C-alpha cells in the first residue's frame with residue numbers, strides 16, 4: 001500500500017500520524033477500503049462542487065439546495081467568507097487523493113455531495129427535505145449543527161423532521177436505514193449539556209464528540225449520555241487543527257470544533273460500509289460501540305459499564321478506530337429486529353423540591369415479543385415542571401450500576417417551561433440486561449428554594465434478546 005502524496009497529507013495528523021494519536025485510517029486503506037461505491041452528503045451551507053479537490057468525487061445525486069429550491073448547492077460567496085463550512089466538511093470525508101492538491105478525505109474514493117440548507121431560514125420542512133434527500137442513493141448524511149448552542153435551549157426535530165428520521169432508518173438505503181452522523185455540539189463554554197439537542201439525542205443519529213491533539217476535552221465540547229464516540233478536532237493554539245478543502249478553491253489548516261469531528265466519523269463509516277454494504281443503521285452503531293478506543297483520552301468521568309466497556313460523557317466509547325471498524329464489519333452478523341419495551345413508571349406525580357429519587361424494578365417486557373435482554377439505547381422520557389430549568393441535574397442508574405447523566409446543570413437556562421415528554425437518551429448501558437432496578441435522580445444543584453413536579457416518567461428500552469458477547 002502507498003500512502004497519499006498530496007502536499008498537505010503530512011499535516012493531516014489525525015490520519016497520517018506515526019505515534020498512535022490518530023484514527024487508524026491508514027490501516028483501513030491498506031486493507032483495501034477507500035469508500036468506493038459509497039455516497040455521503042453534507043447537510044450544511046453548501047458545497048463548492050468545482051473545488052479542485054472535490055470535483056472528481058462530486059455527486060449531483062447527493063446534493064440539493066433547499067434554501068433556494070433548486071438542485072445546485074453551490075455556496076453564496078461573500079466578502080466575509082460565509083458559507084464555507086460545507087466545503088470544509090466535504091473535503092474531510094472525500095477530498096481526492098494523489099492529485100497534488102490539499103490533502104485527502106478519510107474516504108477518498110467515496111462520492112460526496114451537499115445540501116445547501118443553512119443559508120436561509122431553517123424550518124421543519126427544510127430539515128425534513130434535507131434529511132430525506134434521495135434516501136436510496138445517499139448512504140450516509142453528515143450534520144454538524146442543530147439548535148443554538150447557547151446553554152439555554154431545549155429543542156429537537158419537529159414533526160416533519162422526526163418523520164424523516166423514521167422514514168430514513170426504516171425504508172432508506174433499501175431498508176437497511178440511512179446513517180445519520182451528528183456532531184454533539186459546540187456549546188462547552190456556555191456549559192451546554194447535549195441531551196438538550198434532540199438531533200444528537202436521537203437514537204437515529206450516530207453522535208460524535210471531539211478530542212484535542214494532546215488527548216483532552218476541548219473547550220467547546222458538550223458532555224452528554226447520548227454521545228457514542230469521538231474523533232480528533234481542534235484545541236488550544238499549540239495543538240493542530242483539521243486540514244481540508246476551503247471555499248474559493250483553497251485549502252485550510254484551521255477547521256475546528258465538534259462540527260469538524262462529525263465529517264471525519266462519516267468518512268470512517270463510509271469505509272466501514274464499503275467493507276460490508278449490508279450493515280443496517282443499528283449494526284453501524286454496534287460496530288462503533290465495540291471498536292472505539294478510550295486509550296489516551298483524558299477525562300475525569302471514565303466509568304466501566306455492566307459489560308466491561310469504559311464510557312465517558314465527553315467521549316462516548318472513545319476514539320473511532322477505522323482499521324478495527326472495517327475489520328469487524330466484514331463478517332458481522334446482522335442484529336436481530338429492534339424491540340421496544342415501554343414502562344410507565346410513576347403511580348402518582350412526585351414533588352421535586354431539592355431532590356427526588358424514583359426507584360422501579362422492571363422485567364423489561366418479560367414474556368412479550370418486546371422482551372429485551374440486550375439493551376441498545378435507553379430513554380427516560382420525562383414530563384416535569386420546575387421554576388428554573390438549568391438548576392436541575394438528572395441521573396439514571398441501570399440495574400448493572402451504570403450511572404448515566406441525563407442532564408447536567410446549565411447555569412444559563414432560566415426557563416420556567418420544564419420538560420414536556422423530553423426523551424433523554426443514554427448509550428452507556430449498551431449490551432447490558434435492563435431487567436432489575438432502575439433509579440432516576442433529579443436534584444436541585446442551586447441553593448435557591450426551587451420547586452416543581454415530575455408528572456410522567458416513561459422508561460423506554462430498545463434492544464434485542466439474542467446474540468450477546470462475553471463481557
Ligand SMILES: CC(=O)NC[C@H]1CC[N@H+](Cc2cc(Oc3ccc(N4CC[NH+](CCC(=O)[O-])CC4)nc3)nc(-c3cc(Cl)cc(Cl)c3)c2)CC1
Pocket residue numbers: 043044045082083084085118122123124127128130131143144145146147148155156157158159161
Ligand atoms: C415547531 C417547529 O416547526 N419548529 C421548527 C424548528 C425545529 C428545531 N430546529 C433546530 C435547528 C436549527 C438550525 O439552525 C441553524 C442555522 C444555521 C446554522 N449555522 C449557519 C452558520 N454556520 C457558520 C459556521 C462557520 O461559518 O464556520 C454555523 C451553523 N446552524 C444551525 N439547524 C438545524 C439543523 C441543522 C442541520 Cl446541519 C441539519 C438539520 Cl436536519 C437541522 C436545526 C429549527 C426549526
Ligand SMILES: *[C@@H]1O[C@H](CO)[C@@H](O)[C@H](O)[C@H]1NC(C)=O
Pocket residue numbers: 278334
Ligand atoms: C443482508 O442481511 C440480511 C439479514 O441478515 C440477509 O437476509 C441478506 O441475505 C443479506 N444480504 C446480503 C447481500 O448479504
Ligand SMILES: [Ca+2]
Pocket residue numbers: 065068070071072073074
Ligand atoms: Ca442553488
Ligand SMILES: [Ca+2]
Pocket residue numbers: 006053095096097098099100101102103104
Ligand atoms: Ca487532494
Ligand SMILES: [Ca+2]
Pocket residue numbers: 147148149150184185186187192193194197222
Ligand atoms: Ca448543544
Ligand SMILES: [Cl-]
Pocket residue numbers: 340
Ligand atoms: Cl420508536
Ligand code: NA
Pocket residue numbers: 144145146147148149183184185186197
Ligand atoms: Na450544535
Ligand code: NA
Pocket residue numbers: 182199200201202203204205206207226
Ligand atoms: Na444520536
Ligand code: NA
Pocket residue numbers: 303304305306400401402
Ligand atoms: Na460499573
Ligand code: NA
Pocket residue numbers: 399433434435436437
Ligand atoms: Na437484572
